[PDB]
Amino acid sequence: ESMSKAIQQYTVDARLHAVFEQSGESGKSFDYSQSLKTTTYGSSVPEQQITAYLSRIQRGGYIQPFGCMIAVDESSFRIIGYSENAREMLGIMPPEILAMGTDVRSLFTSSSSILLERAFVAREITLLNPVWIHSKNTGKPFYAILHRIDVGVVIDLEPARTEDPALSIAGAVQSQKLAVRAISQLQALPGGDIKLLCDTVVESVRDLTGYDRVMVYKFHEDEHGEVVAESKRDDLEPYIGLHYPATDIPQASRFLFKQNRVRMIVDCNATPVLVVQDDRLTQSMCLVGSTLRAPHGCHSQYMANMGSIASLAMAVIINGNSSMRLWGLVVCHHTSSRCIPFPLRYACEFLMQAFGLQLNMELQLALQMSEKRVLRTQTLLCDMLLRDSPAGIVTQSPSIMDLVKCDGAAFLYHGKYYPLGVAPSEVQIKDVVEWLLANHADSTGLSTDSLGDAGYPGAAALGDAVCGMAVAYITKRDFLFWFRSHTAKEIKWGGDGQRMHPRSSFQAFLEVVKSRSQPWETAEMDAIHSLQLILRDSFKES
Amino acid sequence: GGYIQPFGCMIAVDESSFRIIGYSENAREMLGIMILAMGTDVRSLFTSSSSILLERAFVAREITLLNPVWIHSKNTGKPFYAILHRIDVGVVIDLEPARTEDPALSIAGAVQSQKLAVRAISQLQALPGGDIKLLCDTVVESVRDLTGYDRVMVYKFHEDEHGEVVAESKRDDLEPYIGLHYPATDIPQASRFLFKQNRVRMIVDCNATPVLVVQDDRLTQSMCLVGSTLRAPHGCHSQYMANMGSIASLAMAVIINGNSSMRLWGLVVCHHTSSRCIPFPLRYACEFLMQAFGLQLNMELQLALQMSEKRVLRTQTLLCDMLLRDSPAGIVTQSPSIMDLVKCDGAAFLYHGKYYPLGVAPSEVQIKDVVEWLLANHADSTGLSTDSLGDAGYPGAAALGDAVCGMAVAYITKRDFLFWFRSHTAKEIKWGGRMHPRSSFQAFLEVVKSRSQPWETAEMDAIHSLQLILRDSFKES
Amino acid sequence: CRLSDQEYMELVFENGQILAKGQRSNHNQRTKSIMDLYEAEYNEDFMK
Ligand SMILES: *[C@@H](C)[C@H]1/C(=C/c2[nH]c(/C=C3N=C(/C=C4/NC(=O)C(C=C)=C4C)C(C)=C\3CCC(=O)O)c(CCC(=O)O)c2C)NC(=O)[C@@H]1C
Ligand SMILES: *[C@@H](C)[C@H]1/C(=C/c2[nH]c(/C=C3N=C(/C=C4/NC(=O)C(C=C)=C4C)C(C)=C\3CCC(=O)O)c(CCC(=O)O)c2C)NC(=O)[C@@H]1C
C-alpha cells in the first residue's frame, strides 16, 4: 500500500486539485506544465487534504443539466433532496407540489406510482430498473434509473423521445443487433494479433454510436496511457501514437470509470445544476453511482480547450491474478452536444465485455508463445556452447541478443570484449564494471531502468544511445550485458505549456521519460537468470 | 408444406408487392379475424404504424437486425411479436403472441433483456481461465436461474460425433444424467446443420397437435420452413421426449472457431416436465449469454492445446536426456517413463530379444506373436497405430481380451519396437443410473466394443519425433 | 451463484490507507427464480 504507483499518485492528484482550485479562485490561469513539474510523485500531504479531495470528487452536489435527480427515503416515499431543474422538467410550476418532505408518488401518474412502488420494495435484484414513467401534469415520457445510497433511493430521470412505443422498442432491438453483429465479426478473426483486434473494435464502435472520433487508450505499468487505435473524420487532426502522463487520469477517476461502465458527458459548456438537501443530513449526497454526475472543472476546461464538446467513455476490464484490472478505455469524442439513448449504452457495454474477453485471449496466448520461443532460444544457445568455445555464443546466430528484446549485447570473457549491436566502448565498459563491483558486490544481478538515477557517474557522457543495462554475474570477473536505448527513440507522433492541450500533454510526457528506457519485465529477468545458472554450471565444470 | 407448433402463426408474402402466397391454418383465428382467404394484402391486416414498420423491414437489405417487430393487430388490437426471414421464394413471418399488452412494461422488458444478459456475462467473466468444468457448471447454473426449467445439461460432441453429458443441474427428485454417453446416430447431421444455422430451438409441448401450413397452387415444391423458429419436431424425437419424461425443451448452440468456418462444439439443452413457454426477454438474454460462452470456450481450448504442447515437449526432452546417459535401456528403469508421453494404459519396449513391459501389457509369447504378425503384413512401413487390434488384421486379438484393445507400434530398425497399448472405452465410463437414454447407453458400448480411444494427431507427432530420436541415437553407435 | 444487482462503493481514507468502503453493509436473500420475479412484477392487473 506504499510502493504501488496508485497510492503515491493519490497525493499528487490531491495536490494538483488543490492547485487548480487555488488558481481558479484567485483569478489566475492553471499552468499545466509548471504545476506538473513542481509537484513530485512522492507524498507530503496530511490526512485532511486527501479526505477533502475525495469528498469533493465523490460528494459535490452538481449534476449535468440534461436530466433531473430526486432522492427519497425508503420508509415512506418522502423526498429528502432534489435538483432544481426538476421543477423545470416535471412541469410542476404554474400548495407547493415540489417541497421537501412531500410524497414522491404524487409527482407521476397513478400507474407510474404503482410501478415505482413495486420497484421500491424489492430484494437483491429487481426487474423494473429502469422504469418508463409519465409525469402527472404534462405527460413527458421519462426513463427513471433507481439506485441505492446509504440514506435512501436516488432516482435519475432522463427525458425520452415522444413517439409510438413500437419505435421505442425498435430503437433498442436494432441497437442490440448491431452490437451482436459486431461481436460475431470479432469472433471470426485470425488470432495472434492485438492490433487487428483494436482496429476492428474502433470501427465497430464508431459505426455503432456515430461520434466524430473514436480512440483506444492502453495503460502501461507506469500507469500512463497510449493511443493504440483511432478512427477520425478525415479533416480532424489525428492523435494515434500519442503518449500522455499518468496524472491526466486521476486514480479516483479510474476507480469511478471501473464502477459505472459507460460514462457520458453531453455538453462541456453547459451550466451545472445545484442539488438542494436537508438540514438533518450530516454530509452531502453521494453521487458516486448517479449517471448525471457533472465532471469537475478541470476536465470541462480540458475538453473545451482541446475541441470536444461531448464524450462517452467505456472501460476495458480484464482478469488479473477474482480480481479485475483496467487495461484501458475506448473513448468517443464529438464536436457538439450529443445525448444517445439508454439502450445504446447497454449495447456498448456488451461489446466492451466481448472485447475484454478477446483481449484476455490474446494476452495469455502471447505470453505462452513468448515462453516457448525463449525456451527454444536457450536450448539452441546451450547446443552452441556445447559444440564450440563459449565465445561461439556471440559469434554466429542465434546469439544472446535473441534472448530478450534489447538494442545491444556484450560478453566479457577474461578481458576479451564481444559487443553486438549498439554498446559502450572498451574503457566505458571497464568503468561500468568498476562501478558495478564497487557498489553492488554481493549480488547475482542488477536491472536498472536508467543509469543516471541508479548512481552511475558516467551516464551523462554515455548518451542516449544506451540508457538501461541488465547485468548477469557469470563469475567475479566475467559478466553478461544487455543494453537498451531511451524510450523517446520509438516515440513518434505527427504533432509555453500554459493551456491544457494534447500537445502540452505530449511535451510533459516527453519531459517525464527523459533519459529512461522501457521497463525490464519479469520474464526477461527469469530468462536471464536461467541462462546465468546454466552458464555458471558449465563454467564451474571446467 | 410442413407443420408448426400451435403457439404461433405463419404467413409468407411476396417481397416486391407484399402479396400473400401461403398461410398457417390457425392464422385466421389467433389474429382475431372472424378476409385472409387466399391472396390478400398483409398491410390491411395490421394498424398503420405496424404496416409502416413492416414495409421498412421489407425494404432493408439485411432482413435481420430488425427482428423482432412489435406490430399490432387490427381487429382486436392485441400485440404480436413478429419475426421475419427470407426463403428465396418470399418473406416468411412468424407471429408469437405477446402477453404484456402494456406499452410501459414492454419497453422495460426490452431493456431488461439487455441488462440481464450483461449481468450474467459479467458473472461469467469473473472466473479464471484455467478449466472448462467450472465454466460449464457456471453456465448451467446461470441458465437454470434465468429460465427456471427442471433440468439443464451440456452435451459435448466427440471426434466421431457421439455425445457425452459433461455438466448438469437439476431439481433433486430425478435421476442425474451426468456422465452418460450416446451414439452419433441419435442426432442426425441435418439437425446439427440446423443448430449451426439457427442457434436456438424451443419446443413448447411434445404432445401438441401440429398445424398444417396451407400452400398456393402456383408454385412448385414445398416451401422451406428450415429457418422458421416454429417448425414442428419430428415424430421420432417427439416419441423420444415422451418416453424420457420431458415435455418441453430449449436447445441452444455452442459454436467455436475451427479449421475460418465455425464448428459445433456442443449444445446446452434445458428440459422441463410440463409445457413451458417462457417470455421473450429471458430467451434473448440466454441467446446473448451463449455468445460469451462460446468465446470463453474457444479461449480455454486454445490455451489447453498450448499447455499440452509444452508438457509433451518437456517430457520428450527429459526422456531424451535420460536416454543419452549410459545405456538406452534406462528409459523404463526410472520413474519418468514412456507412459507419460502419451495417455496410455501400458507401454512396452522390445530391444535385442529382452522385453521390457510397463503397466497393462501382454506377455512375451503374445509379444513375439504380434511381432511376427507385423513383419508379415507391414514390413516396409515406419509405424502403425490401430485403435482396435481386431478388425485391423491381428488374428490373435481374441486372446488379449478387453485390456489391449488399442495399440500403436513404432519400429526402430526392423526388430526393436516400441509399443503403446490401450484398454477398451468402458473402464472410464460409469453412468451410475423402446427409445430411452438407458437404451442409447450400452448401445453406444456395443457400438464401441473392443475398441480404444483413437490416437490424436499430437500424440502421433510426439511418437514420430521420439522415434526419429531413437533412429538418430542408434545410428550414432 | 445469484444474479444480484450492481452495488456501488465509495473510497474513504482511514487508518492511513485508501479503503473502498461499501455503501450499505447487508437478510432475506432471493429464493425464487428470475422467471417467477418476471411473472410477479410484470403483472398488469391494476389496469383492470
Ligand atoms: C484536473 C483536475 C486534472 C484532470 C482531471 C480529470 N481528468 C479526467 C479524465 C480524463 N483525462 C483525460 C485526458 C486527456 N489528455 C489527453 O491527452 C487526451 C486525449 C488524447 C485526453 C482526453 C482522459 C483521457 C480522460 C478520460 C475521459 C476522456 O477520454 O475524456 C477526469 C474524469 C472526468 C469524468 O468524470 O468523466 C478528471 C476529473 N485531468 C487533467 O489533465 C488535469 C491535470
Ligand atoms: C429418430 C428419427 C432418431 C432421432 C432423431 C432426432 N433426434 C434429434 C435431436 C436430439 N436427439 C437427442 C437424443 C437424446 N438421447 C439422449 O441420450 C439424450 C440426452 C441425454 C437426448 C436428448 C438429442 C441430444 C437431441 C438434441 C436435443 C433435443 O432436441 O432434445 C432430432 C432433431 C429434433 C428437432 O430439433 O426438431 C431428430 C430428428 N434421434 C434418435 O435417437 C433416433 C435414432
CSV table of C-alpha atoms in Angstrom, one decimal, chain A residues 1 7 10 46-47 50-51 54-55 58-59 74 110-111 114-115 118-119 121-129 147-153 251-252 255 259-261 283 286 288-290, chain C residues 2-24 26-47:
chain,number,residue,atom,x,y,z
A,1,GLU,CA,0.0,0.0,0.0
A,7,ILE,CA,-1.2,5.2,-3.7
A,10,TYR,CA,-3.3,9.8,-4.9
A,46,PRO,CA,-1.7,15.3,5.5
A,47,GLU,CA,-5.0,13.3,6.0
A,50,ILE,CA,-6.9,13.7,0.9
A,51,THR,CA,-10.2,13.4,2.7
A,54,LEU,CA,-12.1,12.6,-2.0
A,55,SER,CA,-15.3,14.1,-0.6
A,58,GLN,CA,-17.5,11.9,-4.8
A,59,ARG,CA,-19.9,14.3,-3.0
A,74,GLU,CA,-37.3,4.1,1.5
A,110,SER,CA,-51.1,6.6,-10.8
A,111,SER,CA,-49.8,3.7,-12.9
A,114,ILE,CA,-47.6,1.8,-8.7
A,115,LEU,CA,-44.7,0.7,-10.8
A,118,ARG,CA,-43.2,-2.3,-7.0
A,119,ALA,CA,-39.7,-1.4,-8.0
A,121,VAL,CA,-39.9,-2.7,-2.1
A,122,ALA,CA,-37.6,-5.3,-3.6
A,123,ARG,CA,-34.7,-7.7,-2.9
A,124,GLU,CA,-31.1,-8.2,-4.1
A,125,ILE,CA,-32.3,-7.9,-7.7
A,126,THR,CA,-35.4,-6.2,-9.1
A,127,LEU,CA,-36.8,-6.5,-12.6
A,128,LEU,CA,-38.0,-2.9,-13.1
A,129,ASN,CA,-34.8,-0.9,-13.5
A,147,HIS,CA,-30.0,3.1,-7.3
A,148,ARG,CA,-29.3,3.0,-3.6
A,149,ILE,CA,-27.2,5.2,-1.3
A,150,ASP,CA,-26.6,5.0,2.5
A,151,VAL,CA,-29.7,7.2,3.3
A,152,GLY,CA,-32.3,6.5,0.6
A,153,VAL,CA,-33.0,5.8,-3.1
A,251,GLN,CA,-6.8,7.2,-9.7
A,252,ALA,CA,-10.1,8.1,-8.2
A,255,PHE,CA,-11.9,3.8,-10.0
A,259,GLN,CA,-17.5,1.2,-11.3
A,260,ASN,CA,-20.0,2.6,-13.8
A,261,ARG,CA,-19.0,1.1,-17.1
A,283,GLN,CA,-22.9,15.0,4.8
A,286,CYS,CA,-23.2,10.6,-2.7
A,288,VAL,CA,-20.8,8.0,-6.9
A,289,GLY,CA,-23.3,6.0,-8.9
A,290,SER,CA,-25.5,8.6,-10.5
C,2,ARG,CA,-27.1,-15.3,-7.7
C,3,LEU,CA,-27.5,-12.7,-10.4
C,4,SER,CA,-27.8,-9.8,-7.8
C,5,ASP,CA,-27.6,-6.1,-8.8
C,6,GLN,CA,-24.6,-3.7,-9.1
C,7,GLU,CA,-23.7,-2.4,-5.7
C,8,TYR,CA,-21.8,0.9,-5.7
C,9,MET,CA,-18.9,1.7,-3.3
C,10,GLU,CA,-17.1,4.8,-2.2
C,11,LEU,CA,-13.4,5.4,-1.4
C,12,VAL,CA,-12.6,6.6,2.1
C,13,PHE,CA,-9.2,7.3,3.7
C,14,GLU,CA,-8.9,5.7,7.1
C,15,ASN,CA,-6.0,4.4,9.3
C,16,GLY,CA,-3.5,5.9,6.8
C,17,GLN,CA,-5.0,3.8,3.9
C,18,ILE,CA,-7.3,4.1,1.0
C,19,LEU,CA,-10.1,1.6,1.5
C,20,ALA,CA,-13.2,1.2,-0.7
C,21,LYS,CA,-15.9,1.2,2.0
C,22,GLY,CA,-19.3,-0.1,0.7
C,23,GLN,CA,-22.5,1.9,0.8
C,24,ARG,CA,-24.9,-0.4,2.7
C,26,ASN,CA,-26.1,-6.1,4.0
C,27,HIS,CA,-31.1,-10.7,5.2
C,28,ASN,CA,-33.9,-12.3,3.2
C,29,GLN,CA,-31.9,-13.3,0.1
C,30,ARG,CA,-33.8,-14.3,-3.0
C,31,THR,CA,-35.3,-17.8,-3.0
C,32,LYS,CA,-37.2,-17.7,-6.3
C,33,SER,CA,-36.1,-17.9,-9.9
C,34,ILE,CA,-36.0,-14.8,-12.1
C,35,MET,CA,-38.8,-16.3,-14.1
C,36,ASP,CA,-41.1,-16.1,-11.0
C,37,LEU,CA,-39.9,-12.5,-10.4
C,38,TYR,CA,-40.9,-11.6,-14.0
C,39,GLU,CA,-44.3,-13.3,-13.7
C,40,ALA,CA,-44.9,-11.4,-10.4
C,41,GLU,CA,-43.6,-7.9,-11.1
C,42,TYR,CA,-44.9,-7.6,-14.7
C,43,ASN,CA,-48.5,-8.2,-13.6
C,44,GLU,CA,-50.8,-5.8,-15.4
C,45,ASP,CA,-53.8,-6.4,-13.1
C,46,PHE,CA,-54.3,-2.9,-11.7
C,47,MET,CA,-55.2,-1.6,-15.2
